[PDB]
């Protein structure tokens, strides 16, 4: 048994991304021990949709995509197939036929700051909902009034990204939650990601 997948570089990362610019890591050409995640006591939310959790060590997929971001506590329920919200529509959309596992844990001791941590943003305004697994990092001004809003911010021209204020004294549901979405997708290329033998 050799060359374990670098889940430590994804779950234990120092700096996570915001949900409008969520990071994607292509876990491939390695062997993955998923049961060191399922038996970890740290994860508050662990929901696997297309696949049973204990069967992950036996099924082989050709690659896994790990999408990492930081959201609010009350917004965790929107990271699911078929849910609707600000995050589901304009930040991160899961497909209805989603196979994979959504893992989320409270990171109030890391991403919160006493003066507020404004490094985490989320898209508030968009003309239409995102397609599943679509990335939108455009920071252009939002034309809300259809006046000749020629780029300049002002009345009826909103900045599309709102900042999550994160403070350690916030209640549960306003505290930051780190979310990693593992999407095991199986193209008919030869499979390279398996469990331990």
């Amino acid at each position, epitope marked *: 048994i050799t060359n374990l997948c670098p889940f430590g570089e994804v779950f234990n990362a120092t700096r996570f991304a915001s949900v409008y610019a969520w990071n994607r890591k292509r876990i491939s050409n390695c062997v993955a021990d998923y049961s060191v995640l399922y038996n970890s006591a740290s994860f508050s939310t662990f929901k696997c949709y297309g696949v049973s959790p204990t069967k992950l060590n036996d099924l082989c997929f050709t690659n896994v995509y790990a999408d990492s971001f930081v959201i609010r506590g009350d917004e965790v329920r929107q990271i699911a197939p078929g849910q609707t919200g600000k995050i589901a529509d304009y930040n991160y959309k899961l497909p209805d036929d989603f196979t994979g596992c959504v893992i989320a844990w409270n990171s109030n001791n890391l991403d919160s700051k006493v003066g507020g941590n404004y490094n985490y943003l989320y898209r508030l305004f968009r*003309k239409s909902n995102l397609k599943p697994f679509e990335r939108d990092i455009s920071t252009e001004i939002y034309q*809300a009034g259809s006046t000749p809003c020629n780029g300049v911010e002002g009345f*009826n021209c909103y900045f599309p990204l709102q900042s999550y*204020g994160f403070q350690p004294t916030y209640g549960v549901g306003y505290q930051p939650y780190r979310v990693v979405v593992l999407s095991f997708e199986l193209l008919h290329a030869p499979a390279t990601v398996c469990g331990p033998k």
Partner: antibody
Amino acid sequence: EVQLVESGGGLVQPGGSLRLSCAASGFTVSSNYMSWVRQAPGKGLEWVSVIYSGGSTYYADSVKGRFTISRHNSKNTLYLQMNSLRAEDTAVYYCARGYGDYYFDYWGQGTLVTVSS
Amino acid sequence: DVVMTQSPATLSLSPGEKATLSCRASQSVSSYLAWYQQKPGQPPKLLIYWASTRESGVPDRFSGSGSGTDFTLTISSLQAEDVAVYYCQQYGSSPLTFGGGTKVEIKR
């Protein structure tokens, strides 16, 4: 510059249907968050429904399954269809532009819906 | 759900005084609070949002403070046209709930 003009309020029998319309000027309702907020006579404001910029619709618990918020994009108009109206729905309704269902900077004039036999 | 309580239920102060309206949430709603001013027979007007930031076109005598559960709306100098009902409205929780309202009266 921003105006919200309502119509469709009136007397309706219990169990009836009523279609409130909010025309808008100064902004497009197809790309803005819109809310219907009702106020009982002599009581406080109560949020009824919201439609997002992308088209996602949400309703309060007392009105879920009965009301339907929608909009018709080519004429800058917001609609609220109401079906099976009960006695406690007699209220003044306001259409309000929101900053991402957070706060309502611009409000409609308000129309009264009376539900009685 | 968040039960949003305003105190006092009515307030009568002579003009030129400072009026402090207190609003209290059942949970901690951070700085996700807005204040509205409703004249009789007139739609509500947004005064402040994010519990501190004034709406444009609102005069400088209105201000806000507070965080979490307790919030205050301060009118530094009451004048004649401030006879209205003031609502505090949270938007941190998923259902948007308004307060009970405070009627402000002027002692002439």
